[PDB]
Design a protein around this ligand. Structure first.
Ligand SMILES: *[C@@](O)(C(=O)NCc1ccccc1)[C@H](C[C@@H]1CCCNC1=O)NC(=O)[C@H](Cc1ccc(F)cc1)NC(=O)c1cc2ccccc2o1
Ligand SMILES: *[C@@](O)(C(=O)NCc1ccccc1)[C@H](C[C@@H]1CCCNC1=O)NC(=O)[C@H](Cc1ccc(F)cc1)NC(=O)c1cc2ccccc2o1
Lengths: 302, 302
């Protein structure tokens, strides 16, 4: 029993964190086989960030301008290239701790673990979701750039996020491991801001099923809803539209609990309309949306 | 910016998890140097649990009754002994991945990371606190016994919890790594239950300071309180008494924010008396008590 915001064990990713220095800028990199991946703004001064031309800035660098440190060992850079907003430093040593791994670009609403790191040294691990507005509500300080987000499946690490910057509302933006930003963001100082966000409906419904699995039913009711009428209420509360695909994905949890998906939707509609009236669900007084249907199945009893 | 329920990176503990089997009972063990630590009820059948005499049960076992598996390698047991409620199996191989480590018995209100494991295989990592009633609100299924809780300090792992059982309210009980239960619990099937719990006041106050550090001040007020009058209100709301030691411990956060501890107490008193009125703090609609003052300092900007 019990339900916690669980991250994946971080050891396979710990063995890949290094530190990268260019000039006076130091950040983290990800060392897989003989390549080190890090944010390309490692080559930037602070004045460069106003309007940088990274091709121009990078053509002025050589291999020896990059200092890569893995624990107490310096790693020699023997090539460098840029791919979108990530720099790839080829080093002369393949990481002996490289896990089986993939690079994946995730969809909004998907969750992943973040291994927060400073100076190539992991400091903590936590779970978060890619918001519908393509930010994440992380916990990141100065020096955390190059920290990565990942999922683990049967010993294969799927890396999905590398950290680049903090937006003015305190939420975070970054790229996939091929350097493409999530959302409209760019790596130059501009007036860019997080767009309006929405709640991830299919995740809220998964977490209500987690609550039932863990023995809590107080929020259920005898009603059902059509998908259309549910979405009318969802739109009103800044929830994402629920699709038939979402309903299909919630199939397995529905079957385990005996609660039809559209019946759980009628429950959520009632919770949105009346609030919780001083009650909690799984120890929360807010409707939680950072658990996917897959997360619930993985963590909960069958 | 940002504030997350952060666990320690789990890699150093991942390298220590093994599986232990006795008869038809399999659970997890902790392999450090040439010793494997696991719950002593690994030697029990289900009928043994009604009134077990573990000395009697253990005297009937030999080394070869214990099967220890580390990854794909069987580990040969060459001695066994019991220390309180933990069994110590001496194996013929020292774990080459043993971290620098300590065993610590923690106080209620302290937090730690849990590495949930099944069949010697880590499945997830999360943060929790030892409640005042000496339970933890974990996330544990069948097979999770022997999973451990830990803190990490400068590469030294301080193990503080090994998981033994789930109580009827769905909260969890276990021991330190020397086999002594937290709380009044025992490893035999009885009508034991979690006692009444309280909220960890010094932790709530730490988290209010985290909120201020992260730029949220809406709950502050111009008032102060005496420690005595605060504790009168705390007692009324099932909060733990706040001590002068707690106030001293909150010193550094007080100094960083410029908010005297007793002024933050007046803020908490106002929050307890009026509620939040639909507002949130650090993304929570409840007052959070699973962050110690040390956790806040570690995670937050200075
Ligand atoms: C990274 O660790 C990092 O890259 N530091 C090195 C660096 C900084 C500036 C120029 C070159 C190299 C930073 C992590 C941030 C730090 C703040 C707290 N939380 C974090 O996640 N990332 C940064 O410092 C970026 C650099 C950047 C600037 C512009 C851009 F388009 C892309 C990247 N800056 C910010 O994240 C940030 C937040 C903020 C608030 C107010 C004013 C400026 C500002 O920058
Ligand atoms: C462990 O993984 C474990 O040790 N399994 C092996 C085992 C079970 C029974 C007898 C001998 C060996 C279990 C983890 C629990 C499992 C349930 C879900 N969440 C968990 O954390 N621990 C157990 O199964 C204990 C065994 C035990 C029994 C009595 C005792 F005093 C101490 C330990 N049992 C329970 O945790 C538990 C919960 C529960 C509810 C209702 C009826 C019985 C019952 O037992």
């Amino acid at each position: 029993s019990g339900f916690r915001k669980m991250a994946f064990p971080s050891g396979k990713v710990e063995g890949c964190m290094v530190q990268v220095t260019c000039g006076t800028t130091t950040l983290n990199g990800l060392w897989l086989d003989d390549v080190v991946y890090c944010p390309r703004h490692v080559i930037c001064t602070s004045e460069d960030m106003l309007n940088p031309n990274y091709e121009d800035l990078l053509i002025r660098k050589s291999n020896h301008n990059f200092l890569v440190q893995a624990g107490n060992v310096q790693l020699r850079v023997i090539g460098h290239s840029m791919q979108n907003c990530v720099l790839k430093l080829k080093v002369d040593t393949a990481n002996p701790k490289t896990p089986k791994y993939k690079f994946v670009r995730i969809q909004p609403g998907q969750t992943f673990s973040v291994l927060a790191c400073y100076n190539g040294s992991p400091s903590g691990v936590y779970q978060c979701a890619m918001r519908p507005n393509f930010t994440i509500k992380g916990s990141f300080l100065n020096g955390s750039c190059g920290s990565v987000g990942f999922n683990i499946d049967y010993d294969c690490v799927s890396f999905c996020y590398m950290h680049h910057m903090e937006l003015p509302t305190g939420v975070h933006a970054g790229t996939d491991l091929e350097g493409n930003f999530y959302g409209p963001f760019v790596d130059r100082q501009t007036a860019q801001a997080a767009g309006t966000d929405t709640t991830i409906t299919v995740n809220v419904l998964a977490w209500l099923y987690a609550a039932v699995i863990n023995g809590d039913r107080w929020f259920l009711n005898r009603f059902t809803t059509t998908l259309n009428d549910f979405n009318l209420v969802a739109m009103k509360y800044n929830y994402e539209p629920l699709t038939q695909d979402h309903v299909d994905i919630l199939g397995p949890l529905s079957a385990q609990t005996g609660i039809a998906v559209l019946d759980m939707c009628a429950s959520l509609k009632e919770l949105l309309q009346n609030g919780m009236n001083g009650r909690t669900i799984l120890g929360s007084a807010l409707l939680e949306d950072e658990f996917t249907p897959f997360d619930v199945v993985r963590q909960c009893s069958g």
